[PDB]
Write a protein that binds this DNA or RNA. Structure first.
Ligand SMILES: [Mn+2]
Ligand SMILES: [Mn+2]
Ligand SMILES: [Zn+2]
Ligand SMILES: [Zn+2]
Ligand SMILES: [Zn+2]
Ligand SMILES: [Zn+2]
Lengths: 162, 162
DNA sequence: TTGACTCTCTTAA
DNA sequence: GAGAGTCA
DNA sequence: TTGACTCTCTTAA
DNA sequence: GAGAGTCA
């Protein structure tokens, strides 16, 4: 089993490599009509991606290191959290982008939480619009808003009450 | 079926059968520290479910009718919206429970919207807690809250900024 | 040991 | 959140 | 014609 | 949002 020192070494080599990714400045809604700035460290669109990185899906990557002749591989956004509990309330922990930008590997833009918590950030009003996430959102969720519902609740007869 | 008359007949028959489903009262959070009452028309747990209904999944049902000697079948919650566009902005329209209760077939608890709009209601603060859905929520979403994030954004070195 | 591909899987609407 | 097939 | 089962699929995290 | 195989 990899030691804590060895894991810290993986985390450090990961940070070293990701820190050299292109840094892209994005202006983002914070909620409450305010705008803020996020700096994403974006993995390249095509190979080569950086030492240890490889693409396993359109918006999926993995980080790989070989330690004492054994190959180890992790989801590319999971590496910052290798020393954290990997489940909570019986739910698997997932890497969760506070910037909602999959290519970003900035660990200051990631948290470690259930898939439900993760998904729900998409509709959050944002840190200046009423976010109640204990680990606060960095921005308003991209899907926040009135929605585009096509048809509302309705009945033709009188069989129902709300 | 194809004709408006035939579609109205399907909707009316569906409403008549669903109108005989047991009415179950559910007290629900509305947001803002307030609570309300919903009356769900709940499909039975086991066969027989009602004329035209059959279960295709633990929480999935279908409605079927024979028109012009041909069998026509729909997802059991889609029938109220058979006269509505089946897509919006190129995204498939889905039946969406405002009461977050799958067994419920009360059309006054259903809306017709994209899967994203549908999902996002799970985290809405609710009609008295700040819901901005244009077709308003009937209750606070069951997943609204601070979440249970295990680890927040963090770095070991000094390569990153927010 | 490393890169660049390949494949399938999870969850809850 | 969906569609469709197999039997009786 | 109607009922009661079976199977796999879609989406975007 | 994930894990794992192949080949050189
Ligand atoms: Mn996310
Ligand atoms: Mn729903
Ligand atoms: Zn980012
Ligand atoms: Zn938030
Ligand atoms: Zn209901
Ligand atoms: Zn709402």
């Amino acid at each position: 089993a990899l030691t804590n020192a060895q894991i810290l070494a993986v985390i450090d080599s990961w940070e070293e490599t990701v820190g050299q990714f292109p840094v892209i400045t994005h202006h983002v809604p914070l909620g409450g009509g305010l705008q803020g700035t996020l700096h994403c460290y974006e993995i390249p669109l095509a190979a080569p991606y950086g030492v240890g990185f490889a693409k396993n899906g359109p918006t999926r990557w993995q980080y790989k290191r070989t330690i004492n002749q054994v190959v180890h591989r992790w989801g590319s956004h999971t590496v910052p959290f290798l020393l954290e509990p990997d489940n909570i309330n019986g739910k698997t922990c997932t890497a969760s982008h506070l910037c909602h930008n999959t290519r970003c590997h900035n660990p200051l833009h990631l948290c470690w939480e259930s898939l439900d918590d993760n998904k729900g950030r998409n509709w959050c009003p944002g840190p200046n619009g009423g976010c109640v996430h204990a680990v606060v959102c960095l921005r308003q969720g991209p899907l926040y808003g009135p929605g585009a519902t096509v048809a509302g609740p309705q009945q033709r007869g009188s069989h129902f009450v709300v």
